[PDB]
From a paper:
Our data demonstrate that RbcX-II from the green algae C. reinhardtii functions as a bona fide Rubisco assembly chaperone, despite its considerable evolutionary distance from cyanobacterial and eukaryotic RbcX-I proteins. Like all other known RbcX proteins, CrRbcX-IIa is an arc-shaped dimer with a central hydrophobic cleft that binds the C-terminal sequence of the RbcL subunit. The green algae Chlamydomonas reinhardtii contains two RbcX-II sequences (CrRbcX-IIa and CrRbcX-IIb, orthologs of AtRbcX-II) and no RbcX-I ortholog.
A stable fragment comprising residues 34–156 lacking the flexible C-terminal 33 residues was produced by subtilisin treatment, as determined by mass spectrometry (MS). We recombinantly expressed and purified the truncated CrRbcX-IIa(34–156) protein for further structural analysis. The structural model was built against data to 1.6 Å resolution and refined to final R and Rfree values of 0.177 and 0.206, respectively. The subunits form arch-shaped, two-fold symmetric dimers with a hydrophobic cleft in the center, similar to other known RbcX structures.
Residue numbers in the entry:
A (entry chain B): 34 to 71, 78 to 156
B (entry chain A): 34 to 72, 78 to 156
Write the structure that this text describes.
Amino acid sequence: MHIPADSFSGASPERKAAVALRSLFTFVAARVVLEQLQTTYNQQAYLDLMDFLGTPMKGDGGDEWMAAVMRKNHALALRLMEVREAYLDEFEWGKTMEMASRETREANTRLMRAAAM
Amino acid sequence: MHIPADSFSGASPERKAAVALRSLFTFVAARVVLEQLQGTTYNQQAYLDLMDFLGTPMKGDGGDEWMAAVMRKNHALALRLMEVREAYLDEFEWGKTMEMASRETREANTRLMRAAAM
Ligand SMILES: [Mg+2]
C-alpha cells in the first residue's frame, strides 16, 4: 500500500505562498488569454477581460474574481479556468526554489561582505 | 504578497514568485527572531530595534533593502535575521506548497464548473 506524501497545512507561510501562487496562476492565465484575443463574441470577451483586469484579485487565489468573470461571460471564464489549470504543468516551481535559495545565499553573502572587517 | 508586482517588469512568473518568497522568508525570520528575543543589554537593544524595523515595509528586492537598513543600525541583529532566513530555506515545505496551490486550483475550477452546471 502506497501512503501518499503529506500535502496539507492550515495557517502557515506555505499556505500563504500557495494562495499567492494561485492568484499568480489566475493572473498569468488572464494575460495569456488577453494575448490570444489581441467574432463579435470574441470582441466582447476582449472588452470584458480588459474591464475585469482593471480590478485587483482579492487575496483568495483569484476565485472571487473568476466567479465574477463567469457571471458576465461564461465562455471567457471557461477559457481562463482551462489556462490556469494547464499552467500548473508549465510553471517551473523547481526554478523558483533554486532562485529563491541561491539569491538568499547571495544576498546574505553580499551584505556580510559589505560590513566585514 | 502580490506576486505579479514583485521583482521587475519583464521578469518571469517563476522569478517574481522567487523574489516574493524571499521577502516572505525575511518576514518569517523577523517574526521568529522577535519571539526569541522576548522568550542582556545587547539583546534588549536588538528587541528594541527589531520592533522599530517591523514598523517599516520591505518593499522590494526580497527584503534586502530592509536588511541593509537593519544592518546599518544593528549589525548583530542583521546577522541573526540573515542566518534565520537562510536556514528557513531548508525548513520551508516546498513540495507541499506547490501541491496545495495545484490541488486548490483544480478544486476551485471544479467548484465553479459545478455551480454553472445549472
Ligand atoms: Mg481550446
